C-alpha cells in the first residue's frame, strides 16, 4: 500500500482522489482527500453532530 | 447619481406587477407539466399541474426570473409516490429576445411600414432556487435536487409551450407625422432590474422592468442591459416613459434657438459634450433704441447664446452684448434665466406647460474710468437700454423709482480685477419686478402681442426652422425695443416646445398652438395623449393615463394604466 501525503487542505478538485461530497441526505457539503483505495479523510469536525 | 441611460435614447418601464398581470390575462404560460429524469438505471418523475407564473425580484440586466408555483404534482422517485404540497414552487431564469413575428399589432400614430418584433425567450432555461416538500415532510435533500434536475430537464424540453409574447416593437417604422421620427425605434433592447423589500420580499411594484431603444438611426455599439432601480421608485407609476436629454437638445434646442432669429441656419453648431446649443460666429440679437435716439446693432459673441440644461431646469444664457453706447463708453451685461416644463391639470387633462422658475441673474461689467469721469450722464442712457429687457418694452418712468433702484444699483458695485462689477441676484429680480409698477395685465398684452409676432415670425420661418437672411432683414429692419426682442425670443423658444408638448408647414400647426396658449382653446389638440401614443404606439404592451412628468437626468413621464 501507498498512503497519498501529498494533499492539503486547499488542493484542486480533480474529481477522483479529492471531491466535495454530501453527508448523507441532508444539504451538508464537506471536502474528503482519499489516500488509499476506498479510504477517505474529512478534514473537518462531523457533521451528523 | 441620477437616471443614465449608458447609450440609449427611449425608454419604456412597468413594474413586476404590471408584467405579471399582462401574462396572467394572456394566459399563454404551460399549466400541465411531466417532468421525467432517467439516469444511472434511475427513474424519477414530476407529473402535476403549475399554477399561474409571477416575475418576481430576483432579475437583474439580461436575467429574467419567473416565480413558477405547483398546483399538485406526484413524484415517483423509483417508485417512492409523494404528493407535493400547495406551496411548492420554483424559480425559473429565462432571457428574453426581440424574436421577429409576423405583424399583429396596429400603430393609428405610424405609417406601418415598419417590422413587427415580439419578445419572447431565446432558445436553455436554468433554475436558481426552488422548494419541494411533501404533505409530511419526508422528502430528503437529495430528493429535492434530484426533482429540481427533472424540472430543468423538463423545461429545457418543454420551453416552446411557453408562447407568451412578453412585448411588441415596431423597427424602422415612418411615423404618420413625419416630423416626430425620433418617437419611433430603429435599435431596441430590453432590460431588468428588481429590488428587494425590506422585509426581504419581492418588490412586484417598486422593481423595474425595462425596453430601450435608440431612435433617428443613433448608432449604439455598446448594446447593454443595465436599468437604474430608481427610475420608477420615484415615479410610484405603473408605467414610464424616457427620453434622453441628448435628444433633447439636439433636435428641440436647435429649432428653439434657430427659430428666435438670433441665428441662421449656417451658424449653429451641435454640442453634445456641453449640452449646450450657442452660435459659432457672432451673431446679432436684435435692434437697439439707446436714449440717444439711434438705432444700434445688439452683437454677441460666439459661444455666449448659450441655451442648456442646468439644475433640472431649461437655461438661457446671453453674455458679452456689447455695443458703443455714447462717448466712447463700452458696457457688458450678462444674463441667465431658468424655466421648468411641469405639467398642469387643466379641465382634467394633464397639460405640459413650460413655466418660469426662481428668479433670473444678471451681471454687468465696465471700465473704471467712464464710472469715475461720466458716471451721471451715461446712466441715463444704461437705464434707458436697461428697463427694457425688464418691462419688455422702452418706456420712459418717472425719476423716484430711478433713485429709489439707484442707491441700490450704486451699492452692488465692485472692483476686480480693475473693473466694476455688479451682480443682480434673484431677490433683485423680483424686487425690480415689484417696483416695476406694471401690472400683470399689461404683461400679458404684451405676450398676446408677441405671441401674434411670434406667429407672424414662423410665417416667415421656413421648413427647416431657419429664415431667409432677406426676409430675416425685413422682418429686423423695423424699429423695435430690444426688450421686445427678447419677448419674442422667448416666445418663439417656447412655442418650438410644441414638439415637447404636442404631436402633429409645421408653421400653421404652431399657429394652432399658438391660438391654445394665447386662447385656451384645446378642442382639437388632444393634449399629452398623442405624445403618450408615439411612445405606445411602437412599444405595444399585451393590454393608460399619464399623471407624472419630470427631469431626473432624462425627459421622464410617468402613468397608470
Not at chain 2, 24 to 30: A, F, G, S, V
Not at chain 2, 265 to 276: E, F, K, M
Not at chain 2, 285 to 293: A, I, P, R, T, W
Request: proline letters at 3%; one cysteine or more; glycine letters at 6%.
Amino acid at each position: 500500500m501507498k498512503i497519498n501525503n501529498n494533499f492539503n487542505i486547499d488542493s484542486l478538485i480533480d474529481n477522483r482522489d479529492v471531491a466535495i461530497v454530501r453527508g448523507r441526505k441532508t444539504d451538508t457539503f464537506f471536502k474528503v482527500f482519499q489516500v488509499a483505495p476506498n479510504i477517505w479523510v474529512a478534514p473537518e469536525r462531523y457533521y451528523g453532530e | 447619481g441620477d437616471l443614465s441611460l449608458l447609450g440609449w435614447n427611449t425608454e419604456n418601464s412597468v413594474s413586476f406587477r404590471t408584467m405579471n398581470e399582462f401574462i396572467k390575462k394572456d394566459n399563454l404560460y404551460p399549466k400541465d407539466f411531466k417532468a421525467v429524469y432517467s439516469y444511472r438505471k434511475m427513474t424519477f418523475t414530476a407529473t402535476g399541474t403549475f399554477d399561474s407564473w409571477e416575475m418576481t425580484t430576483g432579475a437583474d440586466g439580461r436575467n429574467i426570473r419567473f416565480k413558477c408555483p405547483i398546483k399538485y404534482a406526484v413524484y415517483d422517485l423509483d417508485g417512492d409516490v409523494f404528493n407535493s404540497s400547495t406551496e411548492n414552487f420554483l424559480l425559473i431564469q429565462v432571457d428574453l429576445t426581440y424574436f421577429d413575428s409576423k405583424t399583429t399589432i396596429n400603430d393609428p400614430t405610424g405609417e406601418n411600414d415598419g417590422k413587427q418584433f415580439n419578445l419572447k425567450i431565446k432558445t436553455n432555461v436554468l433554475i436558481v432556487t426552488y422548494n419541494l416538500t411533501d404533505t409530511d415532510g419526508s422528502m430528503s435533500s437529495e430528493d429535492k435536487d434530484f426533482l429540481s434536475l427533472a424540472f430543468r430537464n423538463w423545461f429545457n424540453e418543454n420551453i416552446q409551450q411557453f408562447e407568451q409574447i412578453f412585448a411588441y416593437i415596431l423597427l424602422d417604422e415612418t411615423a404618420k407625422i413625419p416630423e416626430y421620427q425620433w418617437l419611433k425605434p430603429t435599435q431596441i433592447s430590453y432590460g431588468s432590474a428588481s429590488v428587494e423589500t425590506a422585509n426581504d420580499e419581492p418588490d412586484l411594484d417598486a422593481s423595474i422592468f425595462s425596453a430601450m431603444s435608440m431612435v433617428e438611426n443613433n448608432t449604439n455599439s455598446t448594446p447593454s442591459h443595465a436599468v437604474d432601480n430608481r427610475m420608477l421608485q420615484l415615479t410610484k407609476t405603473q408605467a414610464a416613459f424616457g427620453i434622453s436629454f441628448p435628444l433633447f437638445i439636439e433636435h428641440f434646442l436647435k429649432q428653439a434657438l434657430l427659430s428666435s432669429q438670433f441665428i441662421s441656419v449656417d451658424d449653429i453648431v451641435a454640442d453634445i459634450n456641453t449640452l449646450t446649443i450657442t452660435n459659432n460666429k457672432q451673431i446679432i440679437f436684435g435692434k437697439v433704441e439707446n436714449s440717444d435716439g439711434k438705432n444700434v446693432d445688439s452683437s454677441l459673441k460666439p459661444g455666449k447664446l448659450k441655451l442648456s440644461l442646468q439644475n433640472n431646469l431649461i437655461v438661457l444664457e446671453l453674455f458679452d452684448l456689447t455695443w458703443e453706447q455714447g462717448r466712447g463708453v463700452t458696457g457688458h451685461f450678462d444674463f441667465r434665466q431658468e424655466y421648468e416644463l411641469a405639467l398642469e391639470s387643466k379641465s382634467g387633462k394633464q397639460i405640459p406647460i413650460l413655466k418660469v422658475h426662481d428668479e433670473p441673474e444678471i451681471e454687468y461689467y465696465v471700465e473704471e474710468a467712464q464710472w469715475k469721469t461720466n458716471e451721471d450722464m451715461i446712466v441715463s442712457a444704461v437705464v434707458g437700454t436697461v428697463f427694457s429687457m425688464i418691462l419688455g418694452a422702452s418706456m420712459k418712468l418717472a425719476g423716484s423709482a430711478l433713485s429709489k433702484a439707484g442707491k441700490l444699483i450704486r451699492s452692488k458695485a465692485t472692483t476686480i480685477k480693475g473693473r466694476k462689477k455688479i451682480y443682480i441676484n434673484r431677490s433683485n429680480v423680483r424686487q425690480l419686478r415689484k417696483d416695476s409698477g406694471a401690472t400683470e395685465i399689461e404683461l400679458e398684452r404684451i405676450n398676446r402681442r408677441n405671441s401674434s409676432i411670434a406667429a407672424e415670425d414662423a410665417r416667415l420661418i421656413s421648413n427647416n426652422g431657419t429664415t431667409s437672411i432677406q426676409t430675416l432683414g425685413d422682418m429686423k429692419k423695423k424699429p423695435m425695443s430690444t426688450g421686445q426682442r427678447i419677448a419674442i425670443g422667448a416666445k418663439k423658444i417656447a412655442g418650438t416646445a410644441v414638439m415637447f408638448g404636442a404631436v402633429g408647414n409645421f408653421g400653421e400647426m404652431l399657429i394652432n398652438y399658438i391660438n391654445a396658449m394665447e386662447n385656451n382653446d384645446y378642442s382639437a389638440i388632444p393634449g399629452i395623449n398623442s405624445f403618450m401614443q408615439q411612445c405606445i404606439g411602437a412599444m405595444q404592451w399585451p393590454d393608460l393615463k399619464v399623471t407624472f412628468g419630470k427631469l431626473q437626468g432624462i425627459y421622464l413621464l410617468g402613468g397608470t394604466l
